[PDB]
Design a protein around this nucleic acid. Structure first.
Lengths: 88, 65, 65, 157, 49, 218, 129
RNA sequence: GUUCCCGGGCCUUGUACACACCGUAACAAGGUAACCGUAGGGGAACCUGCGGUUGGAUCACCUCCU
RNA sequence: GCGGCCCCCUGGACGAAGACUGACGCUCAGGUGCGAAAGCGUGGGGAGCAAACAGGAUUAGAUACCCUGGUAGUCCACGCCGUAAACGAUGUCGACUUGGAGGUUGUGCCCUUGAGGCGUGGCUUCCGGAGCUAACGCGUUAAGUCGACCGCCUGGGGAGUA
């Protein structure tokens, strides 16, 4: 879900605007930070056969998101991972 | 369910028992569950009830007798 | 047709239960969609309220126990 | 004259509540020899009564189809419920290399230099009405000249 | 208050309940002649006995 | 003017406008207006009705359903035309050759009821010549004796008799038909859109049609 | 997803005819507009417009005749999967000439005989009949 | 008077039938609806339980409210 | 596949009005995950029903219809088998194509004054047009018109088995 007062913080940092959450350097961050807020879900209970697809969805959209950023500008790519830390 | 009608009656009149359920709860708890079966006869029934509505729509245009 | 879901816009409450009594009977049964012309929105809202009131003994479940 | 021709002939039945009785069918096509042909499906309890019934419908469905003296105009198929008869105009193709339940129609229409083969279905009723469908599906160079170009040596030259 | 004799109660109406729309002009109820016309013309309907 | 001030006026929700194209249509919750091609295409009717009258043409006024069933008897018997206000027989252009089996029968029945044994027999058989005669006169007595085939096939609606339209396209002759925003204009050569069949409309419509046929016969 | 514009364009013309329409509209590629101009000289399509800033709304006024389609047997030839290339002499004329093949040549878009006229060969996009 | 009964006829419904009605398992509602999957058993077809589907039949009468 | 209520964690779908990177999109053999019911190993368990089995009969016979009992099982948790009519038998993403009755969930605009009217999306049902087909019929959720990707068939039985 990603709570709103974590989200607005992240968007205003990476982006120039507060509505600039459509730029790849921000799209990937809110996706990663969404999973970082979802860790509390897959850490406990374990059997979420429905939320399983949700994970595969947002993370796959991130694997290809990082795919084009990789092919277009390796400077902001290595900068995305250097400002948040979503490489490893 | 509970009918009284004071004392001038000389009749039962369990007409509210039928307006309640009567055979309602029975239809499901008299013979085994079968789970999916009733669903099947629900589709057939609707097909013939909605066709009754199509019937009411077919008679309005002519029926010249 | 009814004037409770016309002059009664936005979620029908259940503190005072007299209005749900228009939509249930004196037996403890819940009135069906086809009688009072009331689109499901209003209908299922009443549904939530009712289940809650019966847990708290405001509304009864069956007739007698 | 108009040249009558028998294509299809069979042995079907009715069967009553007594024993078994047979009906007989025929499908004929007539053609003056210019492209004006007409198909007719006749059926009766006997063949001759059916072919004359096939004559009633034949001289009734006379369709006008222009041609290029013996040879056709352009290559076109013939869809009719599974039937896909393809026909090649072939200028100076030397004769008509068509086939059974398909040749005798293009002959009575005055189209003697063509090639053809019935694909898809196999019933004479269908393959024949596929070649008939191939006649109506044709566009005359003059017709296409009327549809576009507005000059024959414009759409072709 | 007959429909065959008189008729239209609603604007261009077949009283039997077959022709309602105001598209209907003159067409009767073949069973009991209701010429779909003006209920205003029903202030001009004279009969006999 | 404005053709009774309602030639396009009002049309049944169940008009279901596949028909929509050529009528334009201003809608009044069930619709109402078949507007356009309705209006100017009445003059094109005057056009062909004059030409096929120069080639000496007969009209077969087919107006059924009691909403034209007497103006048809009028607009047909006011000039020369033959008509069908009564039950339109499915086969009056295709089976027409075999309908004339019966027309040649009526051609002799009429003769024998006027010069034959109309009353030179048992009064029961004489009555049989009476009853039979009038049954052939109200349903087939409209076209009665056609002889030369009808050149213009008039239809009251594509809504109701598209088969009369179907059979018309077996000859490819001019099909003249007044229709409604619930029809299937598939084969008619000179369509005349407009409201439904309506004795008010049909009196203006039909009357003006037979009269314009009278132009070409001169 | 809407992979080949030219292809979905031919589809709007096929059903355009099977809809009794007189003018279709579409986001524009100048190849599409070029073909319209070529089919204008031929008499298939008539009067094309390019009105539209960032949304080029190409308008094309189709054509009937007797109440019959002028474009009735049309289809994309060079498909993204198998793009067929032709020379100058192997080049097939649609219906032996009663139809034209609109080819992408070394001089933009023209017909099959206009390419023979050009003296070069190329990509046969779609047959028009 | 047609509900009882014997025969005839019209309409409709159903059939893997038309060669045309050791145990009946399917096809009429086969008088216990059919079929697939899972486990076990029985001389043998298949049976029992569970989930699903329509490649299924009639929705005809007897009693109560305007 | 799943119907009482609620608490904790949380997923998918959708809509009004704007801001953006600027095709970051789709499918895909080997692979992985979910995978009704059932069987088995293990710890709890048993009201109702019910394989094997005993008994009384319809019967020429009953290990079958029915009934009185009754074990595995039915239930909860951890794994294996990884199977199906897992079938509106309709693979998945995108684009295109006259309407009515509904059902169901939101919003915008107007006197929501009142049980409404005119649009915009998702899912689904019936009647139909363009179209396809052997027919039945599906029909904006298509069996219609295309692009893309994978799998499958070449008569059945043998056998979806060793």
């Amino acid at each position: 879900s990603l709570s709103t007062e974590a989200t607005a913080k992240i968007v205003s940092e990476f982006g120039r605007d507060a509505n600039d959450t459509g730029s790849t350097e921000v799209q990937v961050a809110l996706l990663t930070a969404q999973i970082n807020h979802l860790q509390g879900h897959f850490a406990e209970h374990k059997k979420d056969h429905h939320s399983r697809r949700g994970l595969l969805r947002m993370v796959s959209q991130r694997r290809k998101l990082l795919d084009y950023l990789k092919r277009k500008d390796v400077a902001r790519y290595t900068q995305l991972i250097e400002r948040l830390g979503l490489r490893r | 369910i509970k009918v009284r009608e004071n004392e001038p009656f000389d009749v039962a009149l369990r007409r509210f028992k039928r307006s309640c359920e009567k055979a309602g709860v029975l239809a499901e708890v008299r013979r085994r569950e079968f789970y999916e079966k009733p669903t099947t006869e629900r589709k057939r029934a609707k097909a013939s009830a909605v066709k009754r509505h199509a019937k009411k729509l077919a008679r309005e245009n002519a029926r010249r007798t | 047709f009814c004037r409770f879901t016309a002059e009664g816009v936005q979620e029908i409450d259940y503190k005072d239960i007299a209005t749900l009594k228009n939509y249930i009977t004196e037996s403890g049964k819940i009135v069906p969609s086809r009688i009072t012309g009331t689109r499901a929105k209003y209908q299922r809202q009443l549904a939530r309220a009712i289940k809650r009131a019966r847990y708290l003994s405001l509304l009864p479940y069956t007739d007698r126990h | 004259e108009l040249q009558e021709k028998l294509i299809a002939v069979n042995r079907v039945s009715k069967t009553v509540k007594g024993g078994r009785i047979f009906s007989f069918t025929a499908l004929t096509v007539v053609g003056d020899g210019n492209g004006r042909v007409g198909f007719g499906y006749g059926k009766a309890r006997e063949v001759p009564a059916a072919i004359q019934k096939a004559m009633e419908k034949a001289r009734r469905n006379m369709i006008n189809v222009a041609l290029n003296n013996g040879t056709l105009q352009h290559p076109v198929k013939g869809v009719h419920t599974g039937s896909r008869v393809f026909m090649q105009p072939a200028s100076e193709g030397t004769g008509i290399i068509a086939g059974g339940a398909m040749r005798a129609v293009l002959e009575v229409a005055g189209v003697h230099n063509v090639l053809a083969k019935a694909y898809g279905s196999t019933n004479p009723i269908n393959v024949v009405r596929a070649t008939i469908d191939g006649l109506e599906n044709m566009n005359s160079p003059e017709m296409v000249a009327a549809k576009r170009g507005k000059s024959v040596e414009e759409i072709l030259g | 208050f007959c429909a065959r004799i008189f008729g239209p109660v609603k604007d261009y109406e077949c009283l039997c309940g077959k022709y309602k729309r105001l598209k209907h002009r003159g067409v009767i109820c073949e069973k009991c002649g209701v010429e779909v016309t003006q209920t205003k013309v029903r202030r001009e309907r004279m009969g006999h006995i | 003017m404005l053709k009774a001030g309602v030639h396009f006026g009002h049309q049944t929700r169940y008009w279901n406008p596949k028909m929509k194209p050529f009528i334009f249509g201003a809608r009044n919750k069930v619709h109402i207006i078949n507007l356009e091609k309705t209006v100017p295409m009445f003059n094109e009717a005057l056009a062909e009705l004059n030409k096929i009258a120069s080639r000496k043409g007969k009209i077969l006024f087919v107006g059924t359903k009691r909403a034209a069933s007497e103006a048809v008897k009028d607009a047909a018997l006011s000039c020369d035309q033959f008509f069908v206000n009564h039950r339109w027989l499915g086969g009056m252009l295709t089976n027409w050759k075999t309908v004339r089996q019966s027309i040649k029968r009526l051609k002799d029945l009429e003769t024998q009821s006027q010069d034959g044994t109309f009353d030179k027999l048992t009064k029961k058989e004489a009555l049989m010549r009476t009853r039979e005669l009038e049954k052939l006169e109200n349903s087939l007595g409209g076209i009665k004796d056609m002889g030369g085939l009808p050149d213009a096939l008039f239809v009251i609606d594509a809504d109701h008799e598209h088969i009369a339209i179907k059979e018309a396209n077996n000859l490819g002759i001019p099909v003249f038909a007044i229709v409604d925003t619930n029809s299937d204009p598939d084969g008619v050569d000179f369509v005349i859109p407009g409201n439904d069949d309506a004795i008010r409309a049909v009196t203006l419509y039909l009357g003006a049609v037979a009269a314009t046929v009278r132009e070409g016969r001169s | 997803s809407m992979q080949d514009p030219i292809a979905d364009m031919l589809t709007r013309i096929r059903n355009g005819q099977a809809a009794n329409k007189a003018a279709v509209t579409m986001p524009s590629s100048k190849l599409k507009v070029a073909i319209a101009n070529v089919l204008k000289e031929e008499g298939f399509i008539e009067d094309f417009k390019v009105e539209g800033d960032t949304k080029p709304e190409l308008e094309l006024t189709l054509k009937y005749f007797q109440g019959k389609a002028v474009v009735e047997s049309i289809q994309r030839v060079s498909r993204p999967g198998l793009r067929i290339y032709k020379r100058k002499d192997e080049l097939p004329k649609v219906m032996a000439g009663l139809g034209i093949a609109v080819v992408s040549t070394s001089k933009g878009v023209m017909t099959d005989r206009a390419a023979r006229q050009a003296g070069l060969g190329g990509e046969i996009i779609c047959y028009v009949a």
